Design a protein around this ligand. Sequence first.
Ligand SMILES: [Cl-]
Ligand SMILES: [Cl-]
Ligand SMILES: [Mg+2]
Ligand SMILES: [Mg+2]
Ligand SMILES: [Mg+2]
Ligand SMILES: [Mg+2]
Ligand SMILES: [Mg+2]
Ligand SMILES: [Mg+2]
Ligand SMILES: [Mg+2]
Ligand SMILES: [Mg+2]
Ligand SMILES: [Mg+2]
Ligand code: NA
Ligand code: NA
Ligand code: NA
Ligand code: NA
Ligand code: NA
Ligand code: NA
Lengths: 186, 156, 154, 95, 140
Amino acid sequence: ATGPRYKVPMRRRREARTDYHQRLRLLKSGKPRLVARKSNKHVRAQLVTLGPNGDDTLASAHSSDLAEYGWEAPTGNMPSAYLTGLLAGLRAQEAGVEEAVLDIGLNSPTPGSKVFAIQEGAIDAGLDIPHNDDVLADWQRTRGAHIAEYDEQLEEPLYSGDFDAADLPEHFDELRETLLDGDIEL
Amino acid sequence: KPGAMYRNSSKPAYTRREYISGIPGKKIAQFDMGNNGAGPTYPAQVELVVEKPVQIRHNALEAARVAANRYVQNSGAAANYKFRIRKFPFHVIRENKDGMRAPFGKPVGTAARVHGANHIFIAWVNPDPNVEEAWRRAKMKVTPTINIDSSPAGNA
Amino acid sequence: MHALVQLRGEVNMHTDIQDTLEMLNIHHVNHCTLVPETDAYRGMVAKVNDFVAFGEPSQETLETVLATRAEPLEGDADVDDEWVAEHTDYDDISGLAFALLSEETTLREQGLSPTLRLHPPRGGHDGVKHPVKEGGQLGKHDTEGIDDLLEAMR
Amino acid sequence: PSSNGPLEGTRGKLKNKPRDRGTSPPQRAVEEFDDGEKVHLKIDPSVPNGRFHPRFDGQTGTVEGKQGDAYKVDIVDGGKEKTIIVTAAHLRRQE
Amino acid sequence: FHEMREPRIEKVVVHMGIGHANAEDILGEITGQMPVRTKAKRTVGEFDIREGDPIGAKVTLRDEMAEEFLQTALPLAELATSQFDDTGNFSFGLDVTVNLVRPGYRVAKRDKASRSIPTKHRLNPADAVAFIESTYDVEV
RNA sequence: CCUGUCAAACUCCAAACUUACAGACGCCGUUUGACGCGGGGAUUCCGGUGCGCGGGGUA
RNA sequence: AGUGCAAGAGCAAAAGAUAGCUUGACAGUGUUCUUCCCAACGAGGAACGCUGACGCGAAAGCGUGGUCUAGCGAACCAAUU
RNA sequence: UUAGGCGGCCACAGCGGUGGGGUUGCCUCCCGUACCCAUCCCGAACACGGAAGAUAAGCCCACCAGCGUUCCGGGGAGUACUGGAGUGCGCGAGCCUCUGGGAAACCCGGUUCGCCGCCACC
Ligand SMILES: [Cl-]
Ligand SMILES: [Cl-]
Ligand SMILES: [Mg+2]
Ligand SMILES: [Mg+2]
Ligand SMILES: [Mg+2]
Ligand SMILES: [Mg+2]
Ligand SMILES: [Mg+2]
Ligand SMILES: [Mg+2]
Ligand SMILES: [Mg+2]
Ligand SMILES: [Mg+2]
Ligand SMILES: [Mg+2]
Ligand code: NA
Ligand code: NA
Ligand code: NA
Ligand code: NA
Ligand code: NA
Ligand code: NA
């Protein structure tokens, strides 16, 4: 920018999107990566491999195409993340993928976080991933119990119209139950 | 000491003051002479052109310039002309003043490297070339043979 | 196709240059070889440029020289039309010569020595201290220029 | 030379042009090579590890097995046969 | 367009640059939340050679905690103009600084795809005076 | 802004050229066995000159 | 800028700074390069492995001392495990 | 790709600037702290929960060359330098001819305001 000698960072570093030092360590395993990504409203989960002209996604799942299986609840929560993980994990298995390492991009390794929920899901789908159980949420929170109890302190529906008034961690089970047998795109 | 000892450009460039100390001051008094307040807004422009690459000790520069400008006082102390010596003695010179043992000499002076065809001196005058004469005396005190060249001046 | 003739001896000439002449089948002064005009061959002749004489000869000249100084891969046998016919693909020297010039074959391919050991130039050559453009005898020549030399060394 | 360390006279070959300055792309540090492949040896100034003796910069050897993640490249120094331990970060596919 | 262009207060830093403290206490009550130590850099003649060393405290207030504070701070100040930032900030006073900016600032403070705020979307000294002056007082 | 100069221990640039590997031609090798491997016996480790490039030195 | 110290080189979501934790400055044994270009030569040095035991980390992973190139010593005898 | 995620090359992509875009869907800003989690002080950030509002940032789309960069034309320049050769010239420094290569600065005019891969998606 300033001169001939000026050093312009890599595009993905300018965009503040890729952490290249972590990327390298991640690529060390030689295994596919389980890209765990979030949005204000959604949660994405991809299984990326290395390629000649860039990464190759062999299997993915988005919290949106979750409804495609009977989801009638918000998609930017814990139960959502887990399921998207399990959904991507399954598609992953279908694709012949057996193991991967957790890439959480620029997110933070906070215990019980949605990225780890994503990881728990993918693992339960059958994917073999290097993990640590006590950094994961305690199942109930994954089910969405923390939100149901939060609506207990109601007075006003936590969900604007949406579905239910007291919410449903049960709707969570019905879905995980669904994903664990047959159905299309899995 | 003789010019013969330092007039050739056969040695490496030696100019890094960060690695050379005790370099003698230059004897060259000024580089801009005459009406330096004014810019080259003159009809005529003569130049003294060196005809061979050589090294010119600040010694010779000072003597050459003085003998030229000191003469350009055929026009007066505040005459209408401007005189310029464009070269500076960057090249540090040594002398081995033990015999050939540990002979890397000690800094004894400076010289300017001029390539054949460069102009060492440039004067600016109105149709009043006394300057042509100031240079017959100038190249008299520098090693090389020289060419007195006139540029803007088809007033022959 | 160019005709190569070594005009300067080996003494003092770079080794990598001598080896090149040798790769071109020339191992003595006045020895001549015929070389295709290819990139690979072009680089070689250029390197040897200062100790040789080269150029494209005329059909006639080549024929004169072939007849006068060509030899079998082994032996004395004179390479005349008959020899050419009874030993090569062609019917006579002219036929061979044409083929060489149009670079369709080579002296070896036809069982002939790659080298035309010429005679010293009758009347003397122009000097081995300067190139042609300077009145010498070194470097690339005119077809008319090469012919004179070759002919003088017939 | 005034000294005889490995980095003697390496100012050039081991420095980056101002613009290629800074951490290098991971893609080439992870590249995988097969035994028999020809690879050009060139240290990446930006990459500390996986290095070989500066003297071999410019060589083109033959991958013949690996040691850990590092590769074992056979080269011929002058007339001597040598095996060099080197990481992908410092190798490139010939052709 | 507006609504997302109209200024707002983002943090008010109240700090007492002492030279070696007991002062935290008053900051805690004047604001309403714990103060933070102020280590110093460089060794200097004011017998301040210690690198890591308590030499003051500060308190960054946000939201109501910031208003409820300025609702008494500002009144104790008169100044305005020239004493304003080129980014629409201003410090008066014990120091009390007010950082002002518009709605989409998190873009520059987040981790992922962060970005610098465009000069146009920045807050000018003028656009600042207006907002505040338009909140219980007068400019210059 | 205008204007005057430099670098063996400067470089936004940058040759010729030297060099790793590969293919092609050439030349060479398969009764003259190359390339290479193993062994026996040395001499040698005062050098000199021209040319190109040098570094030191008035030379 | 900083990174202990020459010079040259490397380094920015770090190789620098702060905080916290930790003792991998660990035991064993090698491969290779260097020392000594080519091309034989010891001590020393380095890079890269494996076996074992550990530290940290969600993990990939990182740690075979300090970012890299200086800071080193044979036989005989002693003392030590 | 009517806005996305992971990348490769790592400024042709930087710096600066203009215009345009969200009615249900996407990214955001945005709203909000019971929880997992968090600030040596602050739900600022990090984390979690969520849609009342917005397209003003960001982002995506279209475009501008003033600066920086890449490549090209013409000029500089077959100049500077240079591998090979010479009973060519010069007191010498050094130069010249033949042969094989061949630049930098700078000026003028174009180019460049990224390209490409995989996945997902009215
Ligand atoms: Cl993310
Ligand atoms: Cl090595
Ligand atoms: Mg015979
Ligand atoms: Mg006679
Ligand atoms: Mg003669
Ligand atoms: Mg050098
Ligand atoms: Mg060399
Ligand atoms: Mg290290
Ligand atoms: Mg003894
Ligand atoms: Mg002892
Ligand atoms: Mg807009
Ligand atoms: Na003495
Ligand atoms: Na003279
Ligand atoms: Na780099
Ligand atoms: Na050793
Ligand atoms: Na403290
Ligand atoms: Na917008």
